[PDB]
């Protein structure tokens, strides 16, 4: 991994996302999710009971320009800004960047496989080529989470909503 302790130069807990067997995947942009030269760390776990099956790829991508199908037109405000509410992957297989999901492991990646572990954690040291970004209008890292294999197990009333809980701390943040 990137080998920094979270460094410069209290956690926040987002509302749990209701995963399903069909779900494409979710992302958040930092700092946007906090609402700043910082070492963000991200700590994500499943509320999944032991019968359940399926698996998530957890990735943090630097400078992730979300692309789109079918137009040369650049993304609007509301498409890229999502706060803690987060955004969907319209095409997980292209990671929206026209790049293979299969190769996303070049970025710092962790697996939630429901046999081995329902929890994963990543340190996101500051990557910006300016020393302390200060405006509200850029996101150095994107935390992304994708169902590599579809959620399964249970019956009837259990309704396959098996939640993901995401947690974030801007550890060693200075202003």
């Amino acid at each position: 991994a990137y080998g920094e302790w979270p460094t410069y130069l209290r956690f926040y807990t987002l509302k749990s996302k209701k995963w399903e067997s069909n779900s494409t995947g979710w992302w958040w942009k930092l700092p946007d999710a906090l609402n700043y030269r910082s070492g963000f760390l991200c700590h994500v776990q499943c509320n999944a009971t032991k019968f359940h099956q399926g698996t998530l790829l957890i990735v943090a991508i630097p400078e992730h320009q979300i692309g789109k199908k079918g137009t040369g037109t650049s993304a609007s405000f509301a498409e890229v800004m999502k706060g803690a509410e987060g955004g969907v992957f319209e095409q997980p297989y292209l990671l929206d960047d026209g790049t293979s999901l299969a190769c996303a492991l070049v970025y710092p990646h962790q697996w939630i496989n429901l046999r081995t572990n329902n929890s994963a954690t990543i340190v996101l040291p500051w990557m910006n080529s300016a020393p302390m970004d200060f405006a509200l209008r850029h996101n150095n890292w994107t935390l992304a989470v994708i169902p590599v294999c579809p959620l399964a197990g249970g019956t009837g009333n259990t309704n396959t909503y098996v939640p993901i809980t995401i947690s974030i701390a801007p550890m060693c943040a200075e202003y």
Binding site: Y12, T13, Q45, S167
Partner: peptide, 29 residues
């Protein structure tokens, strides 16, 4: 509650969380 002084109790690892109260409003869950 997420902006307030808090603990997130997962029932995994820890069937029985404990929380000190220094020296009033509430404890809320």
């Amino acid at each position: 509650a997420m902006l307030a002084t808090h603990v997130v109790w997962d029932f995994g690892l820890q069937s029985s969380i404990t929380i000190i109260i220094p020296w009033v409003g509430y404890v809320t869950c």
